[PDB]
């Protein structure tokens with residue numbers, strides 16, 4: 332109950348496939364500051380299951396290397412809200428998407444990280460505008476964005 336933008340009418344099957352973390356923001360600098368920061372994660376692909384859960388492939392920098400991760404976000408009664416199982420209850424919210432170009436999401440435990448996902452390794456000014464508007468509300472204190480060259484590299488090097 333801190334992020335209160337969600338996507339009405341979300342069809343989670345339609346988010347399947349390839350995505351690029353074009354921009355990210357968080358409530359605390361420490362959540363994204365170093366390469367190995369806990370929530371500096373780079374999304375690779377979204378794989379919605381038949382039962383409506385959402386499997387997520389990503390990379391993360393750990394121990395001086397770009398590690399692959401696979402995680403599962405389980406559906407809830409709200410179609411735009413999913414839960415991930417770590418030792419704390421942390422939920423994922425889909426704020427807005429057009430399926431074909433962009434998707435905005437936040438994860439929250441208050442600790443909060445949001446990303447602007449895009450389908451192609453290109454700077455979508457309009458997707459970034461909608462991301463910044465969705466965020467102007469929220470209490471973000473660090474924001475990163477990535478150029479096309481970085482978006483084609485593992486962990487955005």
Ligand SMILES: CCCCOc1ccc(OCCCN2CCOCC2)cc1
Nearest residue numbers: 369372387389391400402423425436438
């Ligand atoms: C529409 C769904 C977009 C994908 O949302 C998420 C992307 C990455 C996430 O990762 C959260 C942190 C994952 N852990 C980082 C530390 O290593 C273990 C995995 C969570 C949701």
